[PDB]
Amino acid sequence: VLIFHGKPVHGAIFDMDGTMFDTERLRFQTLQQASQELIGQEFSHEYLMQCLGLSATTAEKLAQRLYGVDVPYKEIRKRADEMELEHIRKHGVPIKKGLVQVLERLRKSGLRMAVATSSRRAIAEEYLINANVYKFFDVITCGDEVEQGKPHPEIFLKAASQLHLDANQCLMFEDSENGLTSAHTSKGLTILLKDIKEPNDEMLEKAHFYYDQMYDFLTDLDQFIPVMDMPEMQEPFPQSLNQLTVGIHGFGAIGGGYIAQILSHWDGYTKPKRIIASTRNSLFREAVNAFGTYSIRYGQFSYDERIENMSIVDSDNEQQMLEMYTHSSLIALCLPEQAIESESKIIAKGLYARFNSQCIEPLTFLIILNKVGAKYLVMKHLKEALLELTNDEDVTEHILKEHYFCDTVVNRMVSKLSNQNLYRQLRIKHNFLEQHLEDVEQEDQIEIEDCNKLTPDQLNQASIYVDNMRRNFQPGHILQSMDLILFHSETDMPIYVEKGSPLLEKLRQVVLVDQITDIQLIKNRLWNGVHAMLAWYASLMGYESIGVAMGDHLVKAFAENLIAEVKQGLAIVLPNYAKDLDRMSQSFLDSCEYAFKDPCQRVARDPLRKLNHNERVMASIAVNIRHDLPYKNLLKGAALGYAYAIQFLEIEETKAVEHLQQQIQNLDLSTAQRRQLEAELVQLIQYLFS
């Protein structure tokens, strides 16, 4: 099924301690802590590095040589074991960075999987349950279930036979020398993972593949497992979390009501364990952190999408914002154009804090903004902010070169819910909590009848657990069928991002492009151009919102006919984006239908600039004329712009005609076509007067 370096892999057998979990470093720490308590002197780092691989008897004799014959080693070792379980049971088993990402890839590739550990069945199961990785494994082979343990191949041969597989059909993951010998001898595809101590030359010669850590194997495995397809609407997010944090600089409409979905989907195998989002909206921050989750409402399908693992912070709080730019692997900048200059300072501090931190991986920075050269604006202000802060030209330029700054194109209209509407929701939801809290003390009491399975010692202990759980969880049972709605968004999925960052290569809701130019030109002419031309027609007819205007057959007919003429043109110019034009065309018409909230004024701002020769309106006309396509609705659209400028913005008609003739001259058209286009357009402008 899964092909790994030209070898068919049907199985994956993992060692537990030192391979899956970082429990060798914990045993390293607990031995030092246990020594400090009892004998007073702390067992040297160097001694413990020497004990890696050696038996408990050999380790004791070494301790006796260094720290005297009467050193209570068995006492220190027994204490260290108590501290290990004590720590693991409350704080959780330390999982190697990359394991869950690897397991999901192997599992979704249809591999049967086992654990081959020298630990006891009882303790091995608790650890795999504690870590929440037991779900990935079909069978477990343990040291107390074999005649001869590692480095004898029995444990790996048995694990393989239990999965209905020959050893040579299985990947075998291992850290220790004895384990690798066991795995190699069994005949499996051995994968040696360095834990603490550098592996000797014999181990590196023996192993089929060697990696410095789990994440290096994940990078290699990613070459043999596919990037998943574009997520559909109402498609679940992954169940399994990785150890990565991601950031949304600006928890606004687009940040909370789109980017959160892309990050929640991630690569389809895992998703980030924490999504940090910044906002000065205190009501939004406290509300989300109170619920521990918010939801995005998709009106068209009446679907409420639960975005979990969210942590909302204050944009003004320095310690929280630096924590985002220090711990995040990917950050999405989702601010308006007129907030870039001010926010560039707190970004510069964030990237400087990351540079000073001992954070080690380059940051992927997505620029989310509906402007041409949006990246340029952010980078220009970020450059100044870094110089102003550090006063170090070498460090400033290092930061700008180190990280991946990605230009993007987004095609999803989103509406952030008002504070009045949120308060209304928080009031009605709080009511249900009181209605829920008034009939949970009606139940009352906790009882466990004669089980005739559990011992009376642990039967009493079971009652205490369920009692404690019931008290804490029961009040939050209402969250099952209760969503904190903060966003109303359309169903447009794909985000176009500049290719470069390795971290984007597996993101399934992302569409990678070598240069953003092409899709940004489409966004300009097909989306923003039509949106402006439609908004000019909406305003003159005297409709409050562009959504209300679609009720008029004239407006809706114009919109459908206008996208058609622009598409026909762009299909010849960019035939490699044929599927993207057809998708975006329909995505625009769907969103325009009930676009009530967002006004026409914002969309219709600066009509003269938008009617430039190389801009969204006039460029489309010139393309259609050159290739002899219908441009009658584009001509009508161009006229509405000059008409809007005169009536609403109070611009003189002389200024409109002066501007027009200059643009027509610049267009790459025949002398005949120029005069024809001028004569037709001026007649439409003088009609809309009356």
User: Binding to its own copies (CB under 8 A): which residues in 117-176?
Assistant: 125-126, 129-130, 132, 135-136, 138-139, 161-164
Q: Which of 10, 11, 18, 663 binds Mg ion (CB under 5 A)?
A: 18
165's enclosing H/E stretch is none
Q: What CA–CA distance (Å, rounded) separates 156 from 142?
A: 10
> Interface with Mg ion includes 15 (CB under 5 A)?
yes
- Tokens 């069928």 locate to 481
Q: Which of 107, 150, 506, 567 binds its own copies (CB under 8 A)?
A: 107
Q: What CA–CA distance (Å, rounded) separates 654 from 661?
A: 11
Q: What CA–CA distance (Å, rounded) separates 193 from 175?
A: 5
82 annotated among ligand-binding-site residues: no
346 annotated among ligand-binding-site residues: no
> Interface with its own copies includes 450 (CB under 8 A)?
yes
Tell me whether residue 256 or residue 569 sits nearer to its own copies (CB atom).
Answer: 256
User: Taking the complex as a whole, how short is the minimal distance between the CB of residue 317 and its own copies, in angstroms?
Assistant: 12
User: Taking the complex as a whole, how short is the minimal distance between the CB of residue 542 and its own copies, in angstroms?
Assistant: 11
The site map against Mg ion for 177-216 (x = CB under 5 A) is --x-------------------------------------
Positions in 279-338 near its own copies (CB under 8 A): 280-283, 286-287, 289-293, 297, 299, 301-304, 308-309
User: Taking the complex as a whole, how short is the minimal distance between the CB of residue 579 and Mg ion, in angstroms?
Assistant: 20
Q: What CA–CA distance (Å, rounded) separates 61 from 71?
A: 10
Tokens of 218: 């994940």
- Tokens 């929640």 locate to 264
Tell me whether residue 295 or residue 370 sits nearer to its own copies (CB atom).
Answer: 295
- Tokens 């301790």 locate to 63
Q: What CA–CA distance (Å, rounded) separates 411 from 607?
A: 21
Residue 92 identity (one-letter amino acid): G
Phi (first) and psi of residue 329, to 5 degrees: -90, -35
**468 — alpha (psi -120 to 50), left (phi > 0) or beta?**
alpha
Angle, nearest 10°, between helix axes 632-647 and 653-666? 150
Residue 481 identity (one-letter amino acid): S
Q: What CA–CA distance (Å, rounded) separates 239 from 107?
A: 13
> Interface with Mg ion includes 565 (CB under 5 A)?
no
Tell me whether residue 368 or residue 622 sits nearer to Mg ion (CB atom).
Answer: 368
Q: What CA–CA distance (Å, rounded) separates 668 from 674?
A: 9
From 58-66, 334-342, 415-423, 624-632, give the range in contact with its own copies by CB under 8 A. Answer: 415-423
Q: What CA–CA distance (Å, rounded) separates 9 from 584?
A: 41
411 annotated among ligand-binding-site residues: no
Tell me whether residue 98 or residue 641 sits nearer to Cl ion (CB atom).
Answer: 98
598 annotated among ligand-binding-site residues: no
Positions in 284-313 near Mg ion (CB under 5 A): none
281 annotated among ligand-binding-site residues: yes
User: Taking the complex as a whole, how short is the minimal distance between the CB of residue 315 and its own copies, in angstroms?
Assistant: 11
605 annotated among ligand-binding-site residues: yes
By residue count, the chain amounts to: 690
DSSP, collapsed to helix, strand or coil, labels residue 472 as helix
Tell me whether residue 102 or residue 526 sits nearer to Br ion (CB atom).
Answer: 102
343 annotated among ligand-binding-site residues: yes
The site map against Mg ion for 321-360 (x = CB under 5 A) is ----------------------------------------
Tokens of 138: 């079909």
Interface residues toward Mg ion, by CB under 5 A: 15, 17-18, 53, 175-176, 179, 374
Binding site per annotation, positions = 15, 17, 24, 174-175, 253-254, 279-281, 335, 343, 370, 407-408, 414, 416, 602, 605
